[PDB]
Amino acid sequence: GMLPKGFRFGFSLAGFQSEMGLSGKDENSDWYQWCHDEYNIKNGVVSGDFPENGAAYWDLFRKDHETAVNIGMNSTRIGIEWSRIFPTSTEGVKVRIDRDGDNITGITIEKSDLESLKKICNMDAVKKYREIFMDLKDRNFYMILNLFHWSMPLWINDPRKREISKGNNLGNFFSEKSVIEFAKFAAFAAYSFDDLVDVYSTMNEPNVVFSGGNNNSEKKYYSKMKFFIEAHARAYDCIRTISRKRIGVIYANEHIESLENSDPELVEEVTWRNRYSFIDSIKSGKTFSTKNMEENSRWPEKNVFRKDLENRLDWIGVNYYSRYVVRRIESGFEAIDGYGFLCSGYEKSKDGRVVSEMGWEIYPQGLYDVLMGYQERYSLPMMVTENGIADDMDRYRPGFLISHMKMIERAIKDGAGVEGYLHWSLTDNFEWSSGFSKKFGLLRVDYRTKKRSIRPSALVFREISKKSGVPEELEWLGERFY
């Protein structure tokens, strides 16, 4: 047993991606409308697949939980859906919002506010989520409750009203109005589920959202990202008022590199822009300011301390899939096709590495490098909350799982405080704009019958969890991908 005893093995799940399929259809999300959009389908922006024809976890969760146990899983991260719990607006519940100029420095939810929020919530969704969380506790599951996962209620963001003349963007980013209602949602979820969860995550991969729709404007990027910082910190405070349990965030960690390691300073710049600028703000309170940016300037006013953002991060959820190689541009930087996530039309990467069915280069070395950078900068408890591959025939996933687990074992031995591993997709599910054709699951799903089928990777997973690490007789599987 290489990994420490108690190391968590499990799976991550997004509500929107896995819930619908049989009962409990939710048409009240902006992502649901994004997938049913006429322009988006005709112009190839989305696949035309529909989320309501999905894995039906809303009804089959007991079956999936037992299967998770049977393959050696003892933990999970489940994402609840804001659009399910509050189908209608919560703006009518007036709470206290403190502001220092444009800084949202505080939101306070009282017990009577929680009762008023319960009156307008969807009690059917709360009860079902409690049923899901109670079944997980019945099977001794360490439970990570993730509040937000990209999709928003239509009364928060409605893409149907948008006009394509001003850019075809989903628009699921935070404003001051959104932050206030998000704090009420965070408080209510802790008020509703705290006795059934272990830790909290305020949001999943917020950088995927605030990195888009900026028209290459760095000012719009840092300005939009500030609201996500405040969405996280205010969610943290409102949960902490109710719960004594730990609250963190789940981040998307593309491993930023330069070509043949020839530009260490550029990597430091982009790694700060894409990652540390956000985590620094909610961990130590050292954020930035957009007040003095001209529209064409690249960098923010740094060292802007905020006492209301300080110490609002208890743990870091590390999502990793591939790397991200960049070069210098007069504007700043650009990514290089043929490496990392930009391998769609590629057979092998420009480095000669295997490319997934999403067009993603397999690069387990980035996971170790991402974990070490997080450890060196923050020394916070960490959890690999997502890691997987689109692999219908399970050709690479066995070796993909082994090589990335070896990188976690090395990171731990090198000082990284990694407490568990959550593989992405226990079952195949709805992969956003790509639809159902991208199979990330350890279990394959027949979307007509909803039956789940074992891929051999699920059995390799059970062996890794049984042995508390990669046994020597399974190490050969990862050698192709180093």
Author numbering: 0 to 481
What does the paper say about this structure?
The genome of C. divulgatum encodes three GH1 enzyme candidates, from which CIB12 and CIB13 were heterologously expressed and characterized. Purified CIB12 and CIB13 were crystallized using the sitting-drop vapor diffusion method, and their crystal structures were determined to 2.55 Å and 2.22 Å resolution, respectively, by molecular replacement (see the section “Materials and methods” for details). Both structures revealed a classical (β/α)8 TIM-barrel fold with a spherical shape, which is typical for GH1 enzymes and is one of the most common protein folds.
The cleavage of the glycosidic bond involves the formation of a covalent glucosyl-enzyme intermediate, which is then deglycosylated in a hydrolysis reaction via the attack of a water molecule producing the free enzyme and glucose. Both active sites show the presence of an additional area of electron density in each protomer located near the catalytic glutamates: Glu204 (3.9 Å) and Glu388 (2.8 Å) in CIB12 and Glu204 (3.5 Å) and Glu385 (2.8 Å) in CIB13. In CIB12, this density was interpreted as glycerol (two molecules in the CIB12 dimer), whereas the CIB13 dimer contained one molecule of glycerol in one protomer and one molecule of tris(hydroxymethyl)aminomethane (Tris) in the second protomer. Similarly, the Tris molecule in CIB13 was located near His148 (3.2 Å), Trp149 (3.7 Å), Tyr320 (2.6 Å), Trp423 (3.2 Å), Glu430 (3.4 Å), and Trp431 (3.2 Å).
